[PDB]
Design a protein around this nucleic acid. Structure first.
Ligand SMILES: Nc1ncnc2c1ncn2[C@@H]1O[C@H](COP(=O)(O)OP(=O)(O)O)[C@@H](O)[C@H]1O
Ligand code: BEF
Lengths: 98, 88, 107, 93, 539, 107, 93, 95, 80
DNA sequence: TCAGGATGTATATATCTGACACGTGCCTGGAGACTAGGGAGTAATCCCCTTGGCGGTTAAAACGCGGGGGACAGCGCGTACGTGCGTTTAAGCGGTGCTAGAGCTGTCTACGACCAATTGAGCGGCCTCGGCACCGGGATTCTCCA
DNA sequence: TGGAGAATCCCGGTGCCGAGGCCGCTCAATTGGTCGTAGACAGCTCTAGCACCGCTTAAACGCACGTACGCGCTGTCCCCCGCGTTTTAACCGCCAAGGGGATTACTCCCTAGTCTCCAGGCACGTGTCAGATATATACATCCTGA
């Protein structure tokens, strides 16, 4: 029988790997397309510098990482290890964003 | 067989794929992730981006420009209490 | 009379004259005292030296000799007061601190 | 046209602190942003301090009070000592 | 130096083809150039057999002065099979290794570095030579051949800088097109050839010294003398006679109802880039995503949605009835998909090499191009007109009319080739009173800049304002052209034998206009501009 | 000639001259345009009218004829956009909105 | 000494809105604080908008941009409408 | 005798209808003066300064208790516990 | 001199009731006293800094209002 | 499940009482008229950088499958918190008294703005070499089924 | 109940591009005077903050009881993770065009600054009605028993 890892080992390995690095974790092109689609709803025929989209991506990724940290604390508070949409909602409620 | 249009139906918000959200959660320290987290995260990201981009486009239109610069994004982020270093 | 800069008179490496011009052009008050730019430049130099010393320690701890944004992030977030000063600040290409909760580690 | 920054002064301070360490360009831009941010924080705090007391001059007393309001703990005390030392040395010379 | 006869190549391994007089002259020229300088540019016209001349050069310097070292050939992906076939067809004495595949087979070929002259000629492509430059930087190559060398036009190219730092004794460039589309591009070619003589710093000197545009024999002869020992051009008119002649015939077409609607809409109301949307609208409206009635079936509504497609269907019916095999070139791949669906509807035997197809499907497609009596040849200009031998067809039809004329010229030359038996009839489909006409005229103006120098030293806009006839917002469909379509094309026994309403011939004749009616644009854009106690809780 | 305040020309009730003086004396810019005070006074008057509309409605719901801080708090915290505008503002003697969670009620 | 406030103007607006409703002194001081807070927010945003674009004059365009930046949603549209109406009526006289 | 949880709901409704201050004046004033003695000796306070401090403190505590109640309900409880206060303050960014 | 115990248990219960809390643990009172002490220390430090800058010996209501505004908690109804 | 009782709470009338709303005098800040200068609108030029497409590789994303471990429901217990009562304490209210300190006024005087001439510090441009990134290899580590 | 295997770390080599030092120039900081006004200082007033006393009563405190809720345990089941295979689109190299950002020169009109004048708004005084409080009173609601 082939070699298999128990559920949760590769998750810890990925946690360490991604907390040790600093690169962006979202693909560039899909994020840029999403940014342009969102911006179409405010002014048509807009142009973006590349550094503008880079700044937007850095800010978005930092925001999501911090939100996931708060979500993980809220999930641990309920004696769970799986994060769920209610944990995200509670974190955003306590932050004052809802 | 409809080879002239069979690709354009992906709904750009879906370009934020499930592996990318899992990578973000891993950097956030999350060990196990429910299956309904991905749509919730996409909605949260969309709201955040709408706010920041609305402010940035307002700053751009004030200057009577048609190109959104990095300084507009930095001003829009400082506007919301999220200062970003490293983009001038 | 050979021109001597105000930064050298104060004993600083930050520009007192440039800080004075920035204070006068920022519409902060009608008029600006003589010792305000000196005091402000001293404070700015102190804060710069603090972060640079912490980031240099962090870079040397990684067997590197050039400071990168990751080292600045580690220096800021590992210090208890610089983290309060820069609590609402994002550092580009900085990453996060390595931290896993205890309940997620195996028994 | 040109564009002024704090790069050379940050570099001089770095060579005082770590004589053998260098710095990249992204880190230098981050340090420039940090210096600008702290400058504008302190300047705005001193501005509204002068407005509260119906004064029209920003002096070293307003800058000192702004430093004590904005910096936490030991950072405020050491910054105040450095600034006071600089002003005392500048005045006598 | 010493002249090379045909028997020397016969004895030295070249056994496939009987060379020609100009081919032998080119081989001797290449030999003497190799014996005296570092590099040259074999710039014969398309379809004259440069590959045979390079293979003959390999046979020569592999059996005369025993230069047994490795040879590197760089070529586009579509002509890799042609190089591989001719290499063993004409020179089976040299072992040729096709260095291609995914990363794994290329690694397994990395492992064959036993360095015992197991390969004489290494054959690869640009992309592979740029991905595995490190492995391809550790060989002492004698000859470096860059086929279709007009890819090095830009000097800041990564390929230019990568290939410049190679251990090559002799760099040979192959380019059929007149390279001088601009002086800087020709200087980039020359700087790749002779980096020491033509330094990159003399770019300004080269442009300033040769700003001449008239005959000016005093400087035309100077530049000719400068390019005497580097370039070698031979044209079919002076060298390759007795071939069937090609006759380019440009055919005009109108619009459709929704075509005019969207043309005017884009001209008035993503729309960040205007030219691309205008050209898309002229080619076919259905390639806009929002205009389709979403039928997931083939039908007859395709022909009436575009005047270009209507006229194309008329031409295709006529050509299939007359027994003519046809090449079909286009710029955008979406339009090629539309053509493929239309061909599937009308039951036309078609083949498609497009670029981003695969490496081997192109080889299979080229085999089927000539084996089966297949009728329609779907092609892309950039990835189909770069060296394939498609002599089976005898009619080239352009539905695109791209920016620069070299691409269209070489795409047309894909059918006018050594080994052609019938006559070639080049057809263009450009819309009347349209931005396509302006792109065509701008191309034609760019083209006759290199004709001047060849013959001398070698031998308001986006309108096109006749929108008044485009303001009828109707069809303007053509049916009288059916009886004149035999008048423009006089087909005999399997050959095409020997400026009115919708047709114009091309015999080095010019066409001009001055965009009369911009008042339509101004008036319809004026029409475009024509198109207390608030207490929001209470009202 | 006969004097006439700028508020009457603009058709406002908030003062345009006082807003102009505050803009000039606040160290906001070197110069102040002629239409800036009019625009700002109109915006301030509109916002005041919105708050007072909602607070008067809240006072009438309780059978009172005078507005107290409780009515201002109810008006602000019941309207969504005024709640966004004043999300980090404390109103003295205002209390809170009556709201009990669904799980705490008996069932 | 004399201390100025917005009490009389708030009372005039109240009489326009509710002709028979009064207001206590604590609520009036709350409304005065509200008016001052909104004034400072808008003026500061306009100030830094003018500084961003290297201008030295605060105009009604900058006030309009600040109103769009600060007020949320349907509040911004009506506020911009009232401001434009007031400036149009003012310059016509 | 009422069942446990009825007087609690009546108190919730009663104190959510009212607007007065819930901490006694003199103890709060003494606490304020004690805290201020660590910064400068022999200070004086206006009465309105202490009133403003009390209003701000009570608003802060009521908001914190609302967040604490949300965190307690999240964990399938009705009793608020110190860990709920700690979670609420950490998510708010105060810890 | 232990004036933090003057924030009695009934007062904390009333604050929790206004916050909507139905049932309270017995360890909440010390936690709440610590939280209130920290909050008051921050605000009073800022207010005393403002008072010392003006060279006064009396903490006014405007000093408290400015301190609260500086910490991001604007207070309406106490002047300014 | 309904009856009924005890508790709490909403409802109607009467009576103060003090705070809100109105009227008055004046004074200071806003309005009108004029002048001077520089900030900004405007036209013109240029070239950088943005957009749209094709071509081709290849790493990541997607799909499916199998299983185990975590979420969730149910149950029991025992403890800690709510409720009510009687006792105690200290907060609140009023009244008086004292003085420290905030606030206002008038008078200089030293300090910061403004301007003109000058020169060195800092910025842009240009090599250039060493620090870091990639790479292959060997070794140790940690996990998982015994 | 140790060994097999996959992952990661340490070591050596190469190469390459970006951080660092040099250099020329230009513009902004420095120096030297001159003015005018902001602020420092002294003095006087008057108010409001602190301290104390005495009494009332409302609220805090302590105690007892009982109950319901937090918490631990167990069992099920399903859903999320790990892994292998396919396929798709991200990414980078490259080609075109052209729009718009950035600069410069010019001029004109809009705002600052000053003086004069006068009416709006602020401080002050006064009356009267909206609301708080008290008392009876009906009605809703919670809880226990048949
Ligand atoms: N001596 C020859 N006889 C016949 N055909 C030839 C000869 N030399 C070359 N060719 C033809 O040239 C074709 C390939 O040559 P190619 O390099 O494509 O020519 P060109 O450079 O003119 O396009 C082959 O089909 C081959 O038949
Ligand atoms: F120029 Be040949 F068709 F390669």
């Amino acid at each position: 029988k082939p070699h298999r890892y128990r559920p949760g080992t590769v998750a810890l390995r990925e946690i360490r790997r991604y907390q040790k690095s600093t690169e962006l974790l979202i693909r560039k092109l899909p994020f840029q397309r999403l940014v342009r689609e969102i911006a179409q709803d405010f002014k048509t025929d807009l142009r973006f510098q590349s550094s503008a989209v880079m700044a937007l991506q850095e800010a978005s990724e930092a925001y999501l990482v911090g939100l996931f940290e708060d979500t993980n604390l809220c999930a641990i508070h309920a004696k769970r290890v799986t994060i769920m949409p209610k944990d995200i909602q509670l974190a955003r409620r306590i932050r004052g964003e809802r | 067989g409809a080879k002239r249009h069979r690709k354009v139906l992906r709904d750009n918000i879906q370009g934020i794929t499930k592996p990318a959200i899992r990578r973000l959660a891993r950097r956030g320290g999350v060990k196990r992730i429910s299956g309904l987290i991905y749509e919730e995260t996409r909605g949260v990201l969309k709201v955040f981006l709408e706010n920041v981009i609305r402010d940035a486009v307002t700053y751009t239109e004030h200057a009577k420009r048609k190109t959104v610069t990095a300084m507009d994004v930095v001003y829009a982020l400082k506007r919301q209490g999220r200062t970003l270093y490293g983009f001038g | 009379a050979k021109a001597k800069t105000r930064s050298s008179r104060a004993g600083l490496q930050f520009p007192v004259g440039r800080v004075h011009r920035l204070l006068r052009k920022g519409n902060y008050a009608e008029r600006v005292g003589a010792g305000a730019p000196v005091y402000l430049a001293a404070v700015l130099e102190y804060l710069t030296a603090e972060i640079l010393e912490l980031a240099g320690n962090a870079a040397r701890d990684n067997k590197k000799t050039r400071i990168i944004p990751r080292h600045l992030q580690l220096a800021v977030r590992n210090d208890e007061e610089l983290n309060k000063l820069l609590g609402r600040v994002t550092i580009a290409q900085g990453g996060v601190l390595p931290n896993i909760q205890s309940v997620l580690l195996p028994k | 046209t040109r564009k002024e920054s704090y790069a050379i002064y940050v570099y001089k301070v770095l060579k005082q602190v770590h004589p053998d360490t260098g710095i990249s360009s992204k880190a230098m831009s981050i340090m420039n942003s940090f210096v600008n941010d702290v400058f504008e924080r302190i300047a705005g705090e001193a501005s509204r301090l002068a407005h509260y007391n119906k004064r029209s001059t920003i002096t070293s007393r307003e800058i000192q009070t702004a430093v004590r309001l904005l910096l936490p703990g030991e950072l405020a005390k050491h910054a105040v000592s450095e600034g006071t030392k600089a002003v005392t040395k500048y005045t006598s010379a | 130096a010493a002249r090379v006869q045909e028997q020397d190549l016969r004895q030295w391994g070249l056994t496939g083809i009987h060379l020609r007089s100009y081919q032998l002259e080119g081989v001797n020229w290449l030999a003497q150039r190799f014996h005296c300088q570092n590099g040259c540019i074999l710039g014969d016209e398309m379809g004259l057999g440069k590959t045979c001349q390079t293979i003959a050069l390999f046979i020569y310097l592999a059996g005369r002065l025993n230069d047994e070292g490795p040879f590197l050939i760089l070529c586009p992906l579509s002509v890799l099979s042609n190089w591989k076939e001719e290499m063993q067809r004409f020179a089976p004495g040299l072992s040729c290794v096709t260095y291609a595949g995914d990363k794994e087979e290329r690694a397994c070929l990395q492992q064959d570095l036993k360095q015992e002259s197991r390969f004489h000629v290494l054959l690869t492509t640009y992309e592979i030579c740029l991905k595995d430059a490190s492995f391809l930087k550790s060989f002492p190559w004698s000859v470096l051949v860059v086929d279709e060398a007009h890819r090095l036009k830009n000097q800041s190219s990564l390929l230019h800088k990568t290939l410049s730092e190679f251990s090559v004794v002799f760099s040979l460039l192959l380019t059929g097109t007149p390279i001088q589309n601009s002086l800087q591009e020709l200087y980039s070619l020359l700087s790749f050839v002779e980096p020491d003589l033509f330094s990159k710093e003399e770019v300004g000197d080269f442009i300033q010294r040769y700003q001449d545009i008239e005959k000016e024999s005093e400087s035309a002869s100077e530049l000719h003398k400068l390019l005497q020992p580097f370039l070698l051009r031979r044209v079919k008119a002076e060298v390759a006679t007795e071939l069937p002649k090609k006759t380019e015939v440009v055919i005009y077409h109108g619009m459709s109802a929704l075509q005019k609607k969207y043309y005017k809409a884009i001209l008035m109301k993503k729309l960040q880039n205007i030219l691309s949307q205008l050209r898309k609208c002229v080619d076919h409206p259905y390639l806009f995503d929002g205009v389709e009635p979403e039928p997931f079936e083939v039908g007859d509504h395709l022909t009436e949605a575009s005047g270009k497609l209507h006229l194309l269907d008329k031409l295709l019916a006529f050509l299939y009835s007359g027994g003519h095999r046809v090449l079909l070139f286009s710029q955008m791949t979406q339009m090629l998909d539309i053509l493929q669906d239309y061909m599937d509807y009308r039951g036309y035997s078609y083949e498609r090499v497009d670029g981003s197809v695969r490496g081997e499907e192109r080889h299979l497609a080229i085999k089927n191009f000539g084996q089966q009596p297949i009728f329609v040849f779907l092609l892309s200009t950039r990835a189909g007109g770069v060296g394939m031998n498609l002599t089976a067809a005898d009619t080239v039809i352009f539905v695109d009319s791209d920016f620069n004329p070299q691409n269209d010229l070489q795409a047309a030359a894909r059918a006018h080739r050594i080994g052609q038996n019938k006559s070639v009839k080049v057809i263009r489909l450009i819309g009347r009173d349209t931005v396509e006409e302006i792109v065509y005229r701008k191309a034609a103006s760019k083209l006759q800049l290199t004709n001047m120098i060849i013959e001398g030293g070698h031998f308001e806009i986006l309108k096109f304002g006749l929108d008044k006839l485009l303001a009828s917002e109707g069809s303007t469909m053509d049916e009288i052209d059916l009886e004149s379509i035999l008048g423009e094309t006089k087909d005999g026994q399997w050959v095409s034998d020997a400026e009115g309403k919708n047709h114009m011939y091309l015999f080095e004749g010019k066409d001009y206009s001055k965009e009369p009616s911009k008042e339509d644009r101004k008036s319809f854009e004026q029409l475009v501009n024509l198109q207390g106690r608030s207490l929001r809780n209470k009202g």
